[PDB]
Design a protein around this ligand. Structure first.
Ligand SMILES: O=c1ccn([C@@H]2O[C@H](COP(=O)(O)O)[C@@H](O)[C@H]2O)c(=O)[nH]1
Ligand SMILES: O=c1ccn([C@@H]2O[C@H](COP(=O)(O)O)[C@@H](O)[C@H]2O)c(=O)[nH]1
Lengths: 209, 209
């Protein structure tokens, strides 16, 4: 129930840490910090080398037409799933869902973010964004570890069968065990990749659940 | 290093056995016996339910144009890789490789088959088919467990870095350990799915390596 947020910028460091913690994870979340530094080919390299599923955390937040282009390039690169923002509206989410269907891949809908600023505008729209996801047939969601009461509310809207992953564990203050009361899996970045011993840090997090 | 050949025709039986042996495998090979009975949607169901990579063993063996169509439908259905025959020639293999590139997926090249009849025509062309794969950039191959001397020859042609999987273990007479001297992974169907205790059969095969 642990997903590694691999946000190191250097290919060598990213490969090192991911290989060291492979036995504790089942999925690697790759985002723009690594892709904009090393290129989209890094996705296929990771999938080949480690055999883990790859979620591209691109927080797609464009108009429908451009969203389609971004999702197509991401799935062509080998990503198993892509994280998309729901705040830009239903048409923008639908465009992503359409490409995922054509490619046999998945879309994860980001409904409420984990950082402090998320309270300014996203939080007030989060329940509606989640309801929109349900209405559109979304089955994978992303919610905040830093606000378990909001994670519980999100779980209430999407149901027990939907898959919910949650970032904000560790560095941002979120707790593994409390977060897993509501989410299916936790996303952990810095607590693992900046540790003196990433494998020990990952083992420790799992042991704490 | 164990791949389950799930050739049961009934969805309920297929799900039962696959779930029972999940801890012993890392990939599920799905072919026409299950797909033509339960539909292509079974691929996405398996990927979702068990989280295993899915190799579609469709032994694609058509003209280039039709090969492209078959691969596109297979990848749209969610398969991570497709097994293609090399005997129809380079243009037919290239068509599959082109679709895999557009979709961010993989092609496995079947070079020599495991059954007795494979000696009639395929065996004599197998080294050339493997060389063709190398020339086309193929990195995933399928060779026979039933003829380890041929599996060794295939490994010699494709190199140590190419990934080689091998069917014919168990029911067809192939030995797990001997096959793994040359292949990276073994494919096992009936020895596991027809066993009174599939999980015990899988554990036994792994224990025998
Ligand atoms: O609401 C969200 C959505 C995504 N992420 C992402 O999850 C990871 C969390 O990393 P860390 O704080 O564990 O280091 C980062 O890649 C970050 O972009 C969040 O932190 N919060
Ligand atoms: O040369 C080949 C290529 C593919 N397969 C496939 O691998 C599986 C082997 O099943 P079993 O003999 O372990 O039951 C079946 O799905 C079969 O179609 C072979 O057996 N031999």
């Amino acid at each position: 129930r642990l997903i590694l947020a691999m946000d190191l910028m250097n290919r060598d460091d990213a490969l090192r840490v991911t290989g060291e913690v492979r036995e504790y994870i089942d999925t690697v979340k790759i985002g723009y910090p690594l892709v904009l530094s090393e290129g989209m080919d890094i996705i296929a390299e990771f999938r080949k080398r480690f055999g883990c599923r790859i979620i591209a955390d691109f927080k797609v937040a464009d108009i429908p037409e451009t969203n389609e282009k971004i999702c197509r390039a991401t799935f062509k690169a080998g990503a198993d799933a892509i994280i998309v923002h729901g705040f830009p509206g239903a048409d923008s989410v639908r465009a992503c869902l359409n490409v995922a269907e054509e490619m046999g891949r998945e879309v994860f809908l980001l409904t409420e973010m984990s950082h402090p600023g998320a309270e300014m505008f996203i939080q007030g729209a989060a329940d509606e964004i989640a309801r929109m996801g349900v209405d559109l047939g979304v089955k994978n969601y992303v919610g905040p570890s830093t606000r378990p009461e909001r994670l519980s509310r999100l779980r209430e809207i999407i149901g027990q069968d939907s898959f919910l992953i949650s970032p904000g564990v560790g560095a941002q203050g979120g707790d593994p065990g409390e977060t897993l009361r509501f989410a299916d899996a936790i996303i952990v970045g810095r607590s693992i990749y900046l540790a003196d011993n990433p494998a020990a840090a990952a083992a420790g997090i799992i042991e704490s659940i």
